[model samples]
Target: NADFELFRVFLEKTCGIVLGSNKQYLVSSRLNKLMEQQGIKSLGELVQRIQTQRGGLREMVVDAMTTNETLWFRDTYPFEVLKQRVLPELIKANGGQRLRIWSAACSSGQEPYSLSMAIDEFEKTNLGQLKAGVQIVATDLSGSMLTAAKAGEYDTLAMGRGLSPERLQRYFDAKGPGRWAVKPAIRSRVEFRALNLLDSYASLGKFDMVFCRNVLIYFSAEVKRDILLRIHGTLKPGGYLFLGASEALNNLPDHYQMVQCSPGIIYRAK
Candidate 1:
């Protein structure tokens, strides 16, 4: 219990993940492979080494704990909202200036590539729009995830989650059995970078719109609010932020205007 508590503090302090008391199973299971490989027999021993020693062991543990599953076109509405409303409006507002969207905490490339597909589809139907082109800035905390995201390939299990048959046929190419590579056209529109939400985002520049969905729940309420404020700063005035379906900006009235998109809601910078 003491080791678990100590590890919880370390996890939150290091990466902003609020590991719970009941989540001992999570740490044990997530760290199980690394512990076995490193011959660190127990959680107590792992935590002891992490606190007393330094370097790659800690990083490896953190990576194993933070890695997670993600879906393509997650929740559907964000991409739909982008294609139908945000793209056209932001394009007109920019007056042909290149558009930028940040896929904050992008996991394994799906969100960013899905964004590219939405823009691609939008471009197909409305020729000559977005003439200055668009860029997707995708960032993640896990280095392994960024590597995978950049590879632009997926197996059938990964593809099955949120990918539609039509979109799959259109956007993916066969890569041996069950695995598929995201087509180059979609892959080219995205840029994946390493970022820890607990660290500086100054290098990321500005965005016309951002997708900070799903990942915020892992943080504490204070950290969540802090991250949201920082995200607000990264947006151009009147720019938009898409939070997770269950996440809301209703409390942060001064910084965001909640725009109801019928089935979903998005926040606009104030």
Candidate 2:
């Protein structure tokens, strides 16, 4: 593994995102597919090309390392809680005007898209007597994934996983052959971008709700502390932070307090 050290340095330097020493297996397993796709002979050769080439190699490396496993309404209960409880509280505090939501580590596009769908349904139902513009910012560390997200298209298999039939009909259109594209109205509500949680996030501004679920499990304790602190800084007062069910904010920083909801636990900065 002559390339492991070099690749590790490159990933950290470019994104401020770290892959731990024990994640060598992850690097090997993920990159092996990319090497095959690029027709490179060996990992050493791939590394040499990445080091020497000045063009698309950077994107290739990013795509190889980034994970893009997601589904619409991946866990339905969170969205339900968001619509019923979290959003109402936020709107009341904000004079019911405009709300900004960020989906961190929003792989492909499912999470934000699901959020948009829920918001749309809620608005139609008049759950809140207030009308507010909802702006969703979905960011991921991988440029390739962001590109796919911006397209807003998914295959039948991708759609079949978690989405209900009625939702699929209402929000998506047949792009021919089992391919479906999210309707323009729904797609327009979201803005997708490339972001690394480890870096300075001055550009993202404050968000009312930040969905950063499932990503912290990969980071070591020190990295988790740094990331959680950064997240606290980017959150507006009373903003909600949603983590995966198995992930917890315990023993990290005291800036956030855990709140138990009927569905699961979420954190709010104090």
Q: Candidate 1's residue-wise lDDT over 84-145, tens digit each?
A: 88888887887758888999988788888999999889999888885877889999876777
Error of 1 at 137 (Å): 0.6
Give the C-alpha lDDT of model 1: 0.79
Per-model C-alpha lDDT, please?
Answer: 0.79, 0.78
Where does the lowest 10-residue lDDT sum fall in candidate 2? Answer: 10-19
How high is each candidate's TM-score? 0.74, 0.73
Candidate 1 Cα outliers beyond 4 Å, as residue runs: 1-69
Question: For model 2, how does the per-residue alpha-carbon lDDT over 1-270 read when each residue is reduced to its tens digit?
Answer: 666777666555543345657778976888788777766665465356545336655555555555556777866888888888888788778877688889998888988999999899878776554466788999987787788899999888999878989999999989979799999989999998888888888999988889987677566557877888888887998789987544566655467888889877788887
Write out the backbone clash pairs for model 1: none
Output the number of the lDDT-best candidate: 1
